Amino acid sequence: MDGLKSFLSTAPVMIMALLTFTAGILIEFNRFYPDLLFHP
Amino acid sequence: FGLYIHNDTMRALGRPQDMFSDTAIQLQPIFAQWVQHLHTLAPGATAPNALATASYAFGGETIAVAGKVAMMPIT
Amino acid sequence: DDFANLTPCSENPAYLAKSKNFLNTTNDPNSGKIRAERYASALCGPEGYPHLIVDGRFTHAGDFLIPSILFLYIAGWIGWVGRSYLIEIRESKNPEMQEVVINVPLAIKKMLGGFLWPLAAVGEYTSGKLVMKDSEIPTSPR
Amino acid sequence: MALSDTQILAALVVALLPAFLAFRLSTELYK
Amino acid sequence: FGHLAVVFVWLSGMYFHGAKFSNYEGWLADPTHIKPSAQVVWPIVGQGILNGDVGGGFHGIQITSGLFYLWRASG
Amino acid sequence: ALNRGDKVRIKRTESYWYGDVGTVASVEKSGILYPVIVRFDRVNYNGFSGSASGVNTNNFAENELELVQ
Amino acid sequence: TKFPKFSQDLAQDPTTRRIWYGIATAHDFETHDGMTEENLYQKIFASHFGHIAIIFLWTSGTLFHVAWQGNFEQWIKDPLNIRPIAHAIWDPHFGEGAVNAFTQAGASNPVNIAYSGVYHWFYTIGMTTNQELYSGAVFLLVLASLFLFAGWLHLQPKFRPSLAWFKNAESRLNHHLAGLFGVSSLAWAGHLVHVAIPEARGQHVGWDNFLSTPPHPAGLMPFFTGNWGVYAADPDTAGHIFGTSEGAGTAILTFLGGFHPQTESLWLTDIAHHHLAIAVIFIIAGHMYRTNWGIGHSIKEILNAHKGPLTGAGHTNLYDTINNSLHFQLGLALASLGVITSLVAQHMYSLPSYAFIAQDHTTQAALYTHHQYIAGFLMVGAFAHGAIFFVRDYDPVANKDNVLARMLEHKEALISHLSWVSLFLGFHTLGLYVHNDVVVAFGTPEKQILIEPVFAQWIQATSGKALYGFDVLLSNPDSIASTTGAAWLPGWLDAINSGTNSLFLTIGPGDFLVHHAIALGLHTTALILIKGALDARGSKLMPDKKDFGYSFPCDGPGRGGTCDISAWDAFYLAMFWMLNTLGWLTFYWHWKHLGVWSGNVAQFNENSTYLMGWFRDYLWANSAQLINGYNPYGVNNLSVWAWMFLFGHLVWATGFMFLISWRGYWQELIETIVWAHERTPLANLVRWKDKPVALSIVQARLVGLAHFTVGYVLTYAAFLIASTAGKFG
Amino acid sequence: SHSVKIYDTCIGCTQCVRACPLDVLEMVPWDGCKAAQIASSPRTEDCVGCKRCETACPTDFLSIRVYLGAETTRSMGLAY
Amino acid sequence: MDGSYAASYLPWILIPMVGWLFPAVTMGLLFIHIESEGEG
Numbered sequence A: 001m002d003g004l005k006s007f008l009s010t011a012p013v014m015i016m017a018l019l020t021f022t023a024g025i026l027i028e029f030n031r032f033y034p035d036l037l038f039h040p
Numbered sequence B: 001f002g003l004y005i006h007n008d009t010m011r012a013l014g015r016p017q018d019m020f021s022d023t024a025i026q027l028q029p030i031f032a033q034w035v036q037h038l039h040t041l042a043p044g045a046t047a048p049n050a051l052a053t054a055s056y057a058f059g060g061e062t063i064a065v066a067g068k069v070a071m072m073p074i075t
Numbered sequence C: 001d002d003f004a005n006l007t008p009c010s011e012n013p014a015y016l017a018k019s020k021n022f023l024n025t026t027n028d029p030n031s032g033k034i035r036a037e038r039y040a041s042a043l044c045g046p047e048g049y050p051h052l053i054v055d056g057r058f059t060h061a062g063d064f065l066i067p068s069i070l071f072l073y074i075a076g077w078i079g080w081v082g083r084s085y086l087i088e089i090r091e092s093k094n095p096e097m098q099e100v101v102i103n104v105p106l107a108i109k110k111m112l113g114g115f116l117w118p119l120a121a122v123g124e125y126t127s128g129k130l131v132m133k134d135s136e137i138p139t140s141p142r
Numbered sequence D: 001m002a003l004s005d006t007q008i009l010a011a012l013v014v015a016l017l018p019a020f021l022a023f024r025l026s027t028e029l030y031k
Numbered sequence E: 001f002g003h004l005a006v007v008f009v010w011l012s013g014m015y016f017h018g019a020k021f022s023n024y025e026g027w028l029a030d031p032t033h034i035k036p037s038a039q040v041v042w043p044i045v046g047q048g049i050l051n052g053d054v055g056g057g058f059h060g061i062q063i064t065s066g067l068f069y070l071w072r073a074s075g
Numbered sequence F: 001a002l003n004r005g006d007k008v009r010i011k012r013t014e015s016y017w018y019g020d021v022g023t024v025a026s027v028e029k030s031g032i033l034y035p036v037i038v039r040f041d042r043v044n045y046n047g048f049s050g051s052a053s054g055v056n057t058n059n060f061a062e063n064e065l066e067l068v069q
Numbered sequence G: 001t002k003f004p005k006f007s008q009d010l011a012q013d014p015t016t017r018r019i020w021y022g023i024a025t026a027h028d029f030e031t032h033d034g035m036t037e038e039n040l041y042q043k044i045f046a047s048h049f050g051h052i053a054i055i056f057l058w059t060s061g062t063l064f065h066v067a068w069q070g071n072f073e074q075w076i077k078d079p080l081n082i083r084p085i086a087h088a089i090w091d092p093h094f095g096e097g098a099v100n101a102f103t104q105a106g107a108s109n110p111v112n113i114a115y116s117g118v119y120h121w122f123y124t125i126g127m128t129t130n131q132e133l134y135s136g137a138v139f140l141l142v143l144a145s146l147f148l149f150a151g152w153l154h155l156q157p158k159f160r161p162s163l164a165w166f167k168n169a170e171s172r173l174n175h176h177l178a179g180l181f182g183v184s185s186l187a188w189a190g191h192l193v194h195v196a197i198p199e200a201r202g203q204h205v206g207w208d209n210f211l212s213t214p215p216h217p218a219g220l221m222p223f224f225t226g227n228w229g230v231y232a233a234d235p236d237t238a239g240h241i242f243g244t245s246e247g248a249g250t251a252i253l254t255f256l257g258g259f260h261p262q263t264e265s266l267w268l269t270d271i272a273h274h275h276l277a278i279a280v281i282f283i284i285a286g287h288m289y290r291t292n293w294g295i296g297h298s299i300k301e302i303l304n305a306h307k308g309p310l311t312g313a314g315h316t317n318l319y320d321t322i323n324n325s326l327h328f329q330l331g332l333a334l335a336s337l338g339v340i341t342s343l344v345a346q347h348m349y350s351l352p353s354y355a356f357i358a359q360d361h362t363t364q365a366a367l368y369t370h371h372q373y374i375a376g377f378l379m380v381g382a383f384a385h386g387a388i389f390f391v392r393d394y395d396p397v398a399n400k401d402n403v404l405a406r407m408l409e410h411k412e413a414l415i416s417h418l419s420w421v422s423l424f425l426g427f428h429t430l431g432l433y434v435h436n437d438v439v440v441a442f443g444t445p446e447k448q449i450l451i452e453p454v455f456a457q458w459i460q461a462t463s464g465k466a467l468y469g470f471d472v473l474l475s476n477p478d479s480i481a482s483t484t485g486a487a488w489l490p491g492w493l494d495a496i497n498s499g500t501n502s503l504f505l506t507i508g509p510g511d512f513l514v515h516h517a518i519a520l521g522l523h524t525t526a527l528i529l530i531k532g533a534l535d536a537r538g539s540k541l542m543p544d545k546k547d548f549g550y551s552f553p554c555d556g557p558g559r560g561g562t563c564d565i566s567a568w569d570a571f572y573l574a575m576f577w578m579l580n581t582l583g584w585l586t587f588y589w590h591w592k593h594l595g596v597w598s599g600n601v602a603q604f605n606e607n608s609t610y611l612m613g614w615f616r617d618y619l620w621a622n623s624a625q626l627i628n629g630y631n632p633y634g635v636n637n638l639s640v641w642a643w644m645f646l647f648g649h650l651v652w653a654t655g656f657m658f659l660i661s662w663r664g665y666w667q668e669l670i671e672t673i674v675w676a677h678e679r680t681p682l683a684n685l686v687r688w689k690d691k692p693v694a695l696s697i698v699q700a701r702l703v704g705l706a707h708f709t710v711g712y713v714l715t716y717a718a719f720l721i722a723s724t725a726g727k728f729g
Numbered sequence H: 001s002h003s004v005k006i007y008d009t010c011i012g013c014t015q016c017v018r019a020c021p022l023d024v025l026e027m028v029p030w031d032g033c034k035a036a037q038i039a040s041s042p043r044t045e046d047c048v049g050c051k052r053c054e055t056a057c058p059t060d061f062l063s064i065r066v067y068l069g070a071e072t073t074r075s076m077g078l079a080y
Numbered sequence I: 001m002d003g004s005y006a007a008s009y010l011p012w013i014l015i016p017m018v019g020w021l022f023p024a025v026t027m028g029l030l031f032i033h034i035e036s037e038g039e040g
């Protein structure tokens, strides 16, 4: 529905969705490649 | 709080005999000790159909489980 | 012959002694060994821990430079997309409502265009619409 | 060697003078 | 009604995490030698060190909420 | 000079919109010290603590405003 | 009511607030009723006389009490094994245990232990017996009397200076540079040559025989004939024992450099040539400004001539602005004094001048902390009184388009870029600290981000330190700078390369992090002070702040609320950041020097890269003996320090009550108490002369800040003294 | 007592007069605004300085200001 | 409460005056002065 679409696009939902995506990216990358202190 | 401060100063001045301590001027909670004694005697006559006290915090034996104390009198 | 107080971790007795007991960070049991072999390249102090040198030399460019460009690109991306989205919103007859309720189509459209932020930034600076004149900005009384 | 009683007493007597002068200065500044 | 639903979700979550990610079955056999534990940590950036040994070959966070004793008293 | 549907810049030197751009809502006859009425997009600080918004209109004299359009 | 006589607005106040504000505005001579400029300047002159006399009396009292109840004559026989004594203790409230605990340093009664490091100073300058100390105390009493009488005298109608006399900048600068600085330095050099050096070489010299004892075998002949090198021949050898004639040379002016082998301090002859040279330079400098002979520069033309096409009017009309504004001068003096005090601390912990003072670690730590805190206070005061100047004595038309008015033109840019640099420091510094803490806590301390302080180590190398192996400038023997035949190089290089002193201490990643944290603190405190000073004139929220004075409560809850909007409130906020920055500074210094003195630099080097090491290895570890000052089992000599530690921890908390709770609550409570007193029998016979009211908002902020600062200072002083005394004292 | 001053940007909206709880302000005919009325402060000796008049003023910055000065019993709002 | 310094009796009389006598004296004098309604 239109109202659900508008509610999903409010500021808190967007910022938390972006934060979850970024956190997932970082956690997965550190799962596969940990202990990266510098570019070798 | 002035009791605590007075004790602190007396201890700092090397005068432990002027403190509010059990080895010095004593402030004994006589009413609390009396009610503890009353509740310890409750299983006897005041609550005759009770086998033991409501809690051993008031007094009695030291209930210990395994190697640790479960509950003992709290003076 | 620089860093006479620093030694490579490969021949540092303290680092070598303490590197056989590295903890496994992840579920992979080889993470400790991988960290131990990867940290042997850097320079260790007497405490056995690696150190970073940021004097500007390119031999240690991995310590600061490569991450510096890596961070700066992303930060410029974020700032540029945010600024461009704000500027585009400013002409919609209700910018505040579109500031709390994000225009997701326009938002993602601006997201996908941020990889060219240095070229866009220099073009804006040359075109003169990147920076406003001091006479057009509100200022508090002196 | 350590000081004498007369030395301390003379120090007190000497310090009497700056007390009087400071009293006069404070009264003058109060005006 | 909404707050009741939230509390129900919390309680059901506690029971689920005590059923799947806990050593309650192991602790029940040896209650005096095994520490209660119902939170287990993913090893990602070294937080697997938090999964300390709680006895009986189980690694996890020791819990002090007392759910294990309540469950044993509940049959 | 200033009239309906205008775009002017403030030079009050103590107004909230000093250097800002406002629109001339209307002007009135003589005998008024500050006859020009100017409204602004941004609101000022006017209002009690915790107020949702402020005020986006004011009165100015003809010498305190410069034409932009 | 009479008090306060200088403000009729306060004198007609029926409440007790009149008693408070009367004290607060007492020494604010500018706002007094019926005050003229001439009277203002004369009263300030007399008050400055009074402060000088107070300083002299304080020094005299220190000398007298040390001579009377101290162990100066015993201390000089063994400076490395006998505790100096500050003053005797006479406390009827004491008990037997305290009397036994405080009978220390070989005394026969309860007594304190001096930590001001004045015994070393008196030993170095020459005085060795109690009679000399007593004579000094009496002479300082006489000096204080003379200055008090002078303050009285230049207040009489026949001696009150004119306003034109006060505004004479050129003559004041000439006299206070050639005379106050140069002549005093020359006299101190003469004292060192004629008395201090012979006394340190064993030859006793005093008022009785200084007229027949030549400081040098060749008297005034080489000096007058230009053969000055004679005075530098035969210096003190490395085997010289202070105060004796073993290994003592005859040179009175040398350039040995480095430190004395025995006292670990600078050579006295080096101090002599130093103060003599700076005396000559100051005397030359004091002949610059034109006073009465046509020759000499005039400050106004110099200021007005240094214009610029970029800054507009440059330094035009600044002479009038500075001369006619006492607050501008006070701010300049305070800033300079704060910078100089910081310099004194930094160059005095690393370059000790007094004999056997580097081995008394407690006094060194106390001196550094004391003078650094003084410098912080002065630096805050400079900005505060500069903001006062902007509020009161700044004339925009006179300073139109010059540097002073042009500062307010790009003040928004100033505050913006200063906010950016403060945020940039704080974010990425706290991030590194938290990263190291988290990674260490997870059992993997090898992933810590450790940045070597490359630039500071390069500077140390350029000054001659060869540990880092940079081989640059003075560390490079092939470079020209190390091949100039400077007389100080062989000694200075020996001193810096030794690891037994604080001269250019070795550094690591922890020092890098803590220096960047100190930079964050400095930039943030400067941000607060500068923003307050620039916005004191006015801002968007209050365009007419200048009409409301320097210190006012607020503008009410209207316009969104205006709590803490005055410049005084900006100073009030900046004081907390000053205290926090000083705390960081002193914690770093103290921990580093504890490691240095104990020889366990490894502890600091390992544990200073994460905050938990700061918490555990420094605070928790070094508090073990302090809190045990008095114990259920007994009392030791650290009991007073434990008591003062708790006292500070209490006053600090008490300040929170004024800082958090505000006026209306206490006002209503006082209403209730007033009703209770008025309705109580046998108490209505007594009534207050002044209606009791709650403390005002600004007064409350000031009182809370005062309690806070006192608790802060007392707590840190107690902890530092107790920890160092237990560890080494 | 405090000083209440009213400047020429007043538009005769009476908000300051209504917001005054101690009846310090008043309205007097004027000719500089449409309302032909301006605020006045004839009873400043009763003002306490609550700044409600300043809070109610709608003009840019304020056409009315309160400067807190000598504190009397009336100004300090003391009931004892 | 004895000391081995010269004229040990001085703190026996000086400290009380600085402790009790002088503080009370200036306390009362200042209290009288601040409530002196003679002038303004």
Ligand code: CLA
Binding pocket: B009, B012, B013, G087, G088, G089, G090, G091, G092, G093, G098, G112, G639, G640, G643, I015, I018, I019, I022, I023, I026, I027
């Ligand atoms: C009941 C607590 C108590 C009391 C009353 C005292 C009292 C005293 N102690 Mg003491 N002490 C105590 C506990 C106490 N102690 C404890 C627990 C310890 C730790 C074991 C010590 C350790 C100790 C040491 C080590 C020493 C003392 C000393 C002293 C004496 C200092 C002389 C003095 O105050 O004049 C001076 C008065 C002042 C400096 C006033 C300062 C405070 C005021 C408020 C500041 C002034 C503010 C303002 C400008 C005032 C305006 C003017 C005013 C008149 C209105 C004094 C007799 C010293 C001593 O005997 O030498 C004389 C000393 O060396 N004490």
Ligand code: CLA
Binding pocket: G044, G045, G048, G049, G052, G165, G166, G168, G171, G172, G173, G175, G176, G179, G180, G181, G184
């Ligand atoms: C030779 C002439 C002469 C001399 C000696 C002085 C001296 C002084 N004048 Mg001055 N004055 C003069 C001519 C002179 N004046 C003339 C001609 C005029 C009119 C134009 C004035 C007008 C004038 C005014 C209007 C005032 C003074 C004041 C003062 C006093 C300020 C206190 C001070 O600076 O000392 C203390 C400071 C020093 C001695 C030097 C500062 C410290 C240096 C910079 C660094 C530290 C050195 C060293 C490391 C520290 C010691 C360490 C040791 C303790 C271990 C000082 C005694 C003030 C006052 O009221 O005093 C009564 C004042 O307000 N003067």
Ligand code: CLA
Binding pocket: G023, G024, G025, G026, G027, G028, G029, G330, G377, G378, G380, G381, G382, G384, G385, G388, G550, G551, G568, G571, G706, G710
């Ligand atoms: C050379 C030094 C100097 C001089 C001459 C002045 C002079 C002046 N200052 Mg200034 N100031 C200075 C340094 C100086 N200041 C420093 C270093 C700071 C930073 C803290 C300030 C901060 C400052 C502010 C924030 C203000 C002034 C103001 C003023 C003016 C009048 C008010 C006043 O000072 O008296 C009145 C002073 C007081 C009432 C202070 C009493 C508080 C006491 C000293 C606290 C004591 C604590 C307690 C006793 C501890 C007990 C310890 C015990 C428990 C052991 C006056 C022109 C005021 C102004 O604008 O007037 C024009 C003003 O608002 N100054």
Ligand code: CLA
Binding pocket: G419, G422, G423, G424, G425, G426, G427, G430, G520, G524, G527, G528, G573, G574, G576, G577
């Ligand atoms: C430890 C306490 C603390 C901290 C962290 C700060 C931090 C800050 N103060 Mg502050 N301040 C404090 C105590 C503190 N203050 C006290 C006691 C006073 C005395 C009243 C002041 C007085 C004061 C003044 C007067 C000013 C500041 C300013 C600043 C900022 C300067 C930037 C900086 O230093 O680092 C950068 C900031 C940080 C490192 C803090 C951010 C840390 C968090 C954890 C980052 C992550 C966000 C987090 C994940 C969000 C989660 C939310 C969610 C869980 C709900 C910053 C926000 C100045 C300012 O505004 O500068 C622009 C300024 O003008 N403060």
Ligand code: CLA
Binding pocket: D008, D011, D012, D015, G054, G057, G058, G060, G061, G062, G064, G065, G087, G088, G089, G090, I010, I011, I012, I014, I015, I018
């Ligand atoms: C400011 C300097 C100073 C200070 C802080 C002290 C501190 C002390 N003295 Mg002391 N004294 C000093 C100078 C000083 N003395 C001088 C110059 C003399 C020579 C006259 C003496 C002679 C003296 C004697 C004979 C005795 C003390 C004693 C004491 C102790 C008891 C408290 C006291 O002072 O009252 C008693 C002492 C006095 C009243 C002496 C007078 C104080 C001087 C002369 C005036 C100082 C005025 C000062 C600058 C005012 C500052 C104003 C400020 C608050 C705004 C205490 C440790 C007593 C002691 O040892 O007990 C253990 C003791 O018996 N003092």
Ligand SMILES: CC1=C(/C=C/C(C)=C/C=C/C(C)=C\C=C\C=C(C)\C=C\C=C(C)\C=C\C2=C[C@H](C)[C@H](O)CC2(C)C)C(C)(C)C[C@@H](O)C1
Binding pocket: C054, C055, C056, C064, C065, C075, C076, C077, C078, C079, C080, C081, C083, C121
């Ligand atoms: C373009 C852009 C924007 C705006 C950007 C603007 C307006 C920027 C303005 C910048 C200004 C005015 C000034 C900048 C100054 C930069 C300086 C002084 C850089 C100094 C660099 C140094 C000192 C380098 C130091 C060493 C360099 C070397 C390579 C090694 O490491 C060692 C080491 C660390 C010593 C936003 C904010 C709108 C949005 C962004 O997304 C993009």
Ligand code: SF4
Binding pocket: H006, H009, H010, H011, H012, H013, H014, H015, H016, H017, H038, H039, H053, H056, H057, H058, H059, H063, H064
């Ligand atoms: S609130 Fe302001 S504009 Fe309205 S009548 Fe009062 S002073 Fe005039």
Ligand code: SF4
Binding pocket: H004, H019, H020, H021, H022, H023, H024, H025, H046, H047, H048, H049, H050, H051, H052, H053, H054, H066
């Ligand atoms: S401050 Fe309060 S009492 Fe005074 S005029 Fe304004 S509204 Fe009335």
